Every structure is written in C-alpha cells, then in structure tokens.
Amino acid sequence: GYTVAVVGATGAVGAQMIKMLEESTLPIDKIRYLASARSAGKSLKFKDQDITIEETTETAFEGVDIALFSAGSSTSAKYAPYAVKAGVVVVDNTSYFRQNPDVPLVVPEVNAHALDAHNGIIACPNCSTIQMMVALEPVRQKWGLDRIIVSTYQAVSGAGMGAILETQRELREVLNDGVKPCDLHAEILPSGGDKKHYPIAFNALPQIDVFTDNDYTYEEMKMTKETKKIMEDDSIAVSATCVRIPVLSAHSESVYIETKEVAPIEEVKAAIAAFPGAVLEDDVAHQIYPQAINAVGSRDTFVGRIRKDLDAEKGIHMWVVSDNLLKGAAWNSVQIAETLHERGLVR
Amino acid sequence: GYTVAVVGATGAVGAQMIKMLEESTLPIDKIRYLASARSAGKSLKFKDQDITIEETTETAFEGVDIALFSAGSSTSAKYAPYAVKAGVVVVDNTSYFRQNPDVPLVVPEVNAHALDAHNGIIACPNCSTIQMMVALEPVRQKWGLDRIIVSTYQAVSGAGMGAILETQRELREVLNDGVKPCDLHAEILPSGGDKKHYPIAFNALPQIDVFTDNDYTYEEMKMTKETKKIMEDDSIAVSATCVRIPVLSAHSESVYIETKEVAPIEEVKAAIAAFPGAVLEDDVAHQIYPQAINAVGSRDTFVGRIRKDLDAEKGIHMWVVSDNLLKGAAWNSVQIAETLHERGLVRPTAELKFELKLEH
Ligand SMILES: NC(=O)c1ccc[n+]([C@@H]2O[C@H](COP(=O)([O-])OP(=O)(O)OC[C@H]3O[C@@H](n4cnc5c(N)ncnc54)[C@H](OP(=O)(O)O)[C@@H]3O)[C@@H](O)[C@H]2O)c1
Numbered sequence: 001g002y003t004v005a006v007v008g009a010t011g012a013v014g015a016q017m018i019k020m021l022e023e024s025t026l027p028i029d030k031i032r033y034l035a036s037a038r039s040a041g042k043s044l045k046f047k048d049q050d051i052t053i054e055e056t057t058e059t060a061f062e063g064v065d066i067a068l069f070s071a072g073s074s075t076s077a078k079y080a081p082y083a084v085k086a087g088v089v090v091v092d093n094t095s096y097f098r099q100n101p102d103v104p105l106v107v108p109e110v111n112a113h114a115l116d117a118h119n120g121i122i123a124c125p126n127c128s129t130i131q132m133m134v135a136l137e138p139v140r141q142k143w144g145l146d147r148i149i150v151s152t153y154q155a156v157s158g159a160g161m162g163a164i165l166e167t168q169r170e171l172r173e174v175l176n177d178g179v180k181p182c183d184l185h186a187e188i189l190p191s192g193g194d195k196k197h198y199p200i201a202f203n204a205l206p207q208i209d210v211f212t213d214n215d216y217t218y219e220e221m222k223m224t225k226e227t228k229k230i231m232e233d234d235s236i237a238v239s240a241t242c243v244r245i246p247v248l249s250a251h252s253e254s255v256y257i258e259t260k261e262v263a264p265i266e267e268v269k270a271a272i273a274a275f276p277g278a279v280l281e282d283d284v285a286h287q288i289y290p291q292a293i294n295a296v297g298s299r300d301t302f303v304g305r306i307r308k309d310l311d312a313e314k315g316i317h318m319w320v321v322s323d324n325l326l327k328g329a330a331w332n333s334v335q336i337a338e339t340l341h342e343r344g345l346v347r
Numbered sequence: 348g349y350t351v352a353v354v355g356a357t358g359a360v361g362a363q364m365i366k367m368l369e370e371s372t373l374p375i376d377k378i379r380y381l382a383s384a385r386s387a388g389k390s391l392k393f394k395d396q397d398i399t400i401e402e403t404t405e406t407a408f409e410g411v412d413i414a415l416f417s418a419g420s421s422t423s424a425k426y427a428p429y430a431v432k433a434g435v436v437v438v439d440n441t442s443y444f445r446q447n448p449d450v451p452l453v454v455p456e457v458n459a460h461a462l463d464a465h466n467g468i469i470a471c472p473n474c475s476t477i478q479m480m481v482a483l484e485p486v487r488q489k490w491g492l493d494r495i496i497v498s499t500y501q502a503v504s505g506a507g508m509g510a511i512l513e514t515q516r517e518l519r520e521v522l523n524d525g526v527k528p529c530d531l532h533a534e535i536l537p538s539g540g541d542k543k544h545y546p547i548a549f550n551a552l553p554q555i556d557v558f559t560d561n562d563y564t565y566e567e568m569k570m571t572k573e574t575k576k577i578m579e580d581d582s583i584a585v586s587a588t589c590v591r592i593p594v595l596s597a598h599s600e601s602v603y604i605e606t607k608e609v610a611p612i613e614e615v616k617a618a619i620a621a622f623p624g625a626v627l628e629d630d631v632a633h634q635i636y637p638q639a640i641n642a643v644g645s646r647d648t649f650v651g652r653i654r655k656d657l658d659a660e661k662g663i664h665m666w667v668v669s670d671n672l673l674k675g676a677a678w679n680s681v682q683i684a685e686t687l688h689e690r691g692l693v694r695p696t697a698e699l700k701f702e703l704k705l706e707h
Pocket residue numbers: 007008009010011012013014034035036037038039040042056070071072075159160161162163
C-alpha cells in the first residue's frame with residue numbers, strides 16, 4: 001500500500017480529509033498527520049489508531065508516497081517543492097499552483113485525463129468552482145457553453161475552523177444576549193488576511209478572499225480562471241459574485257448559462273442526471289430542489305431549479321448545492337488520489 | 348389633516364407602518380388600526396396615545412381619507428374596493444392589484460407621475476422589486492436597460508411575524524439544544540401557503556412564494572412583471588432566482604444588467620449616488636459595500652460592488668441592499684401617501700373600477 005501524509009490535518013478541511021481517507025479505496029499502509037509546530041505532539045485518530053501530529057518541515061516527507069496539502073498557500077509554496085523533490089506526489093488543495101501550466105487542475109469526473117501530464121503536483125480547484133463544473137460539464141458536452149454568470153451562497157466552513165466558531169459565537173450573542181448584529185465583534189470574516197472584519201450572523205457579506213485590481217475578489221476570479229482551465233476553453237465567458245452567508249457547511253450557487261445550441265430543458269435535466277457525481281433533484285410540483293442542510297455529508301453535487309431563461313433562447317438557470325468540505329475540497333482531493341492509484345500514476 | 352387607517356396593524360409590516368407614520372410629514376388628525384376580529388378590541392400605541400384595534404370590514408372605512416393595506420392579498424381583494432367606494436384612497440402593499448391597468452404601481456423616486464392617473468388604489472411593489480428599481484432607474488435614464496438577471500438573498504421578516512419567530516426558534520434549537528438542522532421541525536417557511544415546510548436555520552431555500560406553471564416561483568415572476576410595469580417598458584428582459592437565507596431583516600440582491608448603450612462604470616457609480624433614495628457604498632480598497640446588518644432601520648437603498656462584466660461590453664454587476672420592511676414595504680407605502688398629499692391627489696374617485704367580491 002501507500003504511505004500517505006495529510007498536511008494541515010488539524011484544520012476544517014484536514015478533519016474531512018481524514019474522514020475521506022478512512023472511507024477510501026486507497027490502500028494505505030501508513031498514515032502521517034502534519035501541521036504547524038504548535039500542533040506537534042498532539043494526537044488524532046485514524047480509524048481506531050492514535051496518530052501523533054508532526055511539525056511540517058523541509059525534511060518531513062521522506063518515505064511519503066502521497067501528500068495531501070490543505071494548510072494554506074504559504075505552507076504549500078514552502079514545503080510542496082521539497083516533497084516533490086523527495087519523490088512525493090502532492091495533491092494540493094490551495095490556490096498556489098492552480099494556474100501553473102505544468103500543474104493539472106482536476107475534477108476527476110470532468111478532466112481526469114489531465115492527471116496523465118503531472119510532474120509531481122496536482123491541484124484541487126476552489127470549492128465553488130468544483131461543484132459548478134460537475135453540474136455544467138454534462139451540458140457543455142452536448143450543447144456547448146458560451147457564458148456563465150454565477151452568484152454564490154457560500155458557507156463559513158470554507159474559511160476554516162476559526163470562521164465556524166466565530167459564526168456560532170456571533171449567533172449566540174444575538175439570540176441569547178440580545179446583541180444587535182451590527183454591534184457584534186468580528187476577527188476573521190469576511191477574510192482572515194484583509195484589514196477589516198465584519199459580522200456574518202444574520203448577514204450576507206459580498207466578499208470572499210481579498211479584492212483584485214479589477215474590483216472582483218480573488219474568489220470570483222478563481223471561478224473565472226479555473227473554469228477556463230478545467231474545461232480547457234478560454235472562450236467560455238465567466239463572471240461571478242461570491243457571497244458569504246450564515247450557513248456552516250454546503251455552498252449553494254445560482255447559475256446562469258448560455259449554451260452554443262438550444263438545449264431542451266428535459267434533455268438538460270436527463271444529461272445532468274446521467275453525469276457521474278451530479279444528482280438531479282428537481283420536482284417543483286412537490287417542492288423538490290437542492291438544499292444546503294440536506295447536502296452536508298454527501299459526496300454528490302445536487303442540481304435543480306433547472307429552467308429556461310424567460311427571454312434568451314439559449315439561456316438556462318439552475319441551483320447547484322454541494323458540501324464544500326467534501327466535493328469542494330477533501331473528497332475531490334481523495335478522489336484525485338484514488339484516480340492516481342487506479343491509473344498507475346503514483347510514480 | 349387626514350384620517351389614516353392601517354389595515355393589518357398588528358403584523359410585521361404593520362408595526363413598521365406605524366413607525367413610518369409616527370415619523371411622517373403627513374398631517375394626521377386621526378389614526379385607525381384595523382386587523383382581524385381576533386385582534387379587534389385590543390390596543391396598540393400611536394405615539395403616546397392608545398388606539399383600539401378594529402375588525403376589518405366593508406363598513407370600517409367611513410370617514411377615512413387614506414388606508415394603507417398590509418393584511419394579505421385576500422384581505423385587499425375583499426376590502427380595498429369597499430374602501431374605494433367609501434371615498435378612501437388606498438395604498439396597497441399586497442400583490443393583488445399590482446398588474447391591474449387601472450392601478451399605478453409606484454416607487455415614488457422612479458414613477459411618481461403614474462400617481463396622477465389613480466382610481467382610488469395605488470399599489471406598492473414587492474420588496475425585492477422596489478430596491479432593484481431604486482438602484483437601476485438612474486442607469487436606465489441615461490443608458491437604457493436591455494436585460495436584468497437577478498439572484499436574491501432574502502430575509503425572513505418578509506414572510507411575516509410567524510416566520511421571524513420560527514427562524515429564531517430553529518436557530519436556538521440548533522445552537523443551544525444541539526439539534527441538527529435537518530432534524531428541525533418547520534411549519535411556515537419557505538411558503539405558508541404550500542404543502543411542505545423546510546428549516547431555514549443554516550440553510551438557503553430557493554423558493555419564495557408558490558411555484559407557477561413556468562417553473563419560476565410567484566416571487567420571481569413578480570420581479571419580472573413589476574419591473575416592466577414600473578419602468579413602463581415591456582422590452583426589458585427580466586429573469587430572477589429568489590432565495591430565502593437566515594437573515595432577519597434586509598434583502599440583498601446580486602444584480603446583473605446589460606444596458607442599451609455602454610455605460611462608463613464610474614459614471615454608473617455617480618448616477619446611482621446622484622439618485623434620490625439610493626446611496627453609493629462602494630470602495631473596495633477599504634472593503635466598503637452594502638451589508639444587510641447595516642441597512643436595517645434606514646429608508647435608503649444601498650448599492651455597491653459595481654463593476655463591468657468581464658466579457659459583455661454592456662454588462663454590469665452590482666450588489667443592492669435595503670431594509671425589506673422599510674423601503675421594501677412600510678416606508679414605500681408611507682412615501683406614496685406623502686406624495687399623494689403633496690400632489691393634491693388625496694380625493695375620492697368618481698367611478699368605481701374594482702370588482703366587489705362580498706356582495707353576498
Ligand atoms: N495545538 C495548538 O497549539 C493549537 C491551538 C489552537 C488551535 N490549533 C489549530 O489551529 C487551527 C486554527 O484553524 P484556522 O481557522 O486557522 O485554519 P483551518 O483553515 O481550519 O486549518 C489550517 C490548517 O493549516 C495548518 N497550518 C497553518 N500554518 C501552517 C504551517 N506553517 N505549517 C504547517 N501547517 C500549517 C494548521 O495547523 P495547526 O493546527 O498546527 O495550526 C491547520 O491544520 C486549527 O486547525 C486548530 O486545530 C492548534
């Protein structure tokens with residue numbers, strides 16, 4: 001079997017990486033948990049076994065076959081090159097390598113073939129991008145994609161364990177202590193690395209990550225650029241608005257597309273239902289549609305509210321929901337690792 | 348001064364109507380509060396005075412100059428026409444009369460002129476529509492509008508007092524009692540009039556109102572039809588997705604438009620800033636943008652995240668926030684009443700144009 005390292009094992013994504021690995025078809029002989037110096041010496045479970053957390057260092061990757069990185073871009077930038085040098089195959093969940101032309105950016109249902117070209121590093125895309133790609137690839141295959149306009153409804157677990165706990169405390173202060181939402185103290189959201197912090201309780205924050213020079217945030221531009229790379233087509237026009245809402249896990253997206261050919265709605269529904277990783281949940285006569293609360297804990301991406309635009313001949317609207325820590329992060333990463341094993345690419 | 352009646356004075360919108368009237372420039376000689384027979388006989392404040400709540404009936408409007416209705420579409424359907432026959436000018440917050448060609452559908456900053464043609468009923472548009480019209484009218488005036496695509500992020504207060512209480516209760520069960528969100532019992536949301544009910548706590552529900560035959564909801568189709576009527580242009584393409592989120596008050600909207608002529612983006616920002624009722628909050632270098640929690644309690648509509656589409660030359664994205672019970676309902680209604688007063692339009696109508704539904 002393999003020796004597998006989880007870098008960032010103690011975080012929100014890390015904890016789900018552990019869960020996905022425990023349930024994986026990857027043959028694992030040895031498991032190692034890496035994090036920062038302040039987590040070193042603590043213990044975490046793998047199934048029934050206690051695993052000592054180790055400090056991530058430049059020489060910590062000896063004997064590792066596969067390393068799953070989910071410890072921030074800074075950690076990946078610094079240590080992933082040393083891992084690769086030592087012969088480790090790295091699956092990276094951060095944004096650092098995503099736009100490197102020698103790094104495949106992979107959603108296995110959509111572009112697993114790109115794994116064949118890897119030179120030691122595979123990048124997992126952004127959580128919001130991944131679920132959109134699972135929903136839209138089956139449509140692209142049959143009728144093409146001219147453009148995408150998306151507005152997201154993103155859960156706080158995407159911003160890490162600290163964000164989850166800040167959200168819970170804020171909500172308790174309002175509901176139990178009577179604090180006005182605008183008077184809440186905040187330290188993390190919308191973005192840990194930005195200057196000002198705002199409450200998320202009973203709010204909708206139109207900022208994920210920091211702003212770029214074109215007044216879209218890095219999150220919004222990630223959806224644009226990663227879509228083009230994953231679908232291998234720079235002609236697909238993509239513009240996004242990414243909003244944080246008071247949901248702990250599971251991202252929702254209002255997705256508008258225009259296809260290249262008119263795609264009959266019932267055929268679109270059947271194409272999505274037929275696509276591995278996508279589940280059609282769409283029966284408005286019985287109020288059936290994807291919901292964040294029902295999607296938590298499942299690896300599937302759920303699609304509904306599928307309907308034609310009222311005016312644009314080739315326009316289609318839909319609602320896409322997935323667990324942002326599973327398919328959006330830890331499951332996509334482990335699924336990459338399984339695909340690497342299944343295709344003889346752990347070399 | 349005027350005798351003013353508030354129909355549905357005991358509800359979520361009613362509470363704000365009272366506040367907006369207390370703070371109004373309307374010369375009010377007498378206030379009447381109408382609700383259901385259950386509420387009739389009880390009391391509520393107007394400023395320091397106690398007001399006895401009355402039953403809403405066909406004969407409850409004698410002597411009233413202006414009635415603000417916010418007690419449900421059925422109540423408006425049944426009683427507004429009787430108020431008009433009593434000589435009352437009705438400002439209706441419900442959907443019932445909005446698409447009637449004899450009824451102006453008004454956002455005063457946008458189409459106050461339409462008030463001149465009233466026949467005793469003036470309709471207030473849906474809350475989601477109102478804030479979007481305040482944001483977009485200044486753009487339409489200068490560069491036109493070809494199409495709008497909007498996704499909403501709507502607060503629970505829009506669904507009434509019960510929905511507010513259900514939301515608070517669900518959140519407390521999760522946060523204080525450790526109930527999983529999917530195990531919560533719901534009775535009201537997403538729509539009181541539909542058969543199935545789902546939790547809102549830690550959820551995003553892509554259903555507001557019931558579904559129509561074209562697979563859009565009534566809320567989504569209201570945004571479509573109301574936009575075309577208010578802007579007096581049936582050629583504006585409008586398609587919406589309306590989503591309830593766990594916010595108590597203030598609606599937010601991710602709004603995409605394509606103009607008829609290219610609109611320079613800094614001039615778009617200036618046009619919105621210059622438009623009465625709209626406030627430009629847009630300085631991303633300092634993380635300045637509209638937020639629901641900061642808009643609650645203000646009558647203004649806040650607009651930011653304004654930026655060009657990455658590909659469509661005439662495309663523009665923005666983020667629009669307003670208190671859904673103020674500009675979205677109570678304030679827009681009171682503002683209509685003030686505008687009627689100011690333009691000498693508070694007077695009985697000559698001919699009845701609305702079906703009487705209680706002749707039995
Ligand atoms: N043992 C301690 O002293 C202690 C006390 C409180 C919290 N923590 C941990 O700190 C994290 C706080 O959560 P969050 O919201 O900031 O982030 P998060 O996104 O949920 O997870 C961040 C992950 O990246 C790891 N990491 C950060 N910098 C690193 C570096 N230079 N090298 C290797 N790994 C690095 C963290 O390890 P670390 O866990 O080592 O930071 C953590 O596993 C939690 O994972 C929590 O377990 C540790």
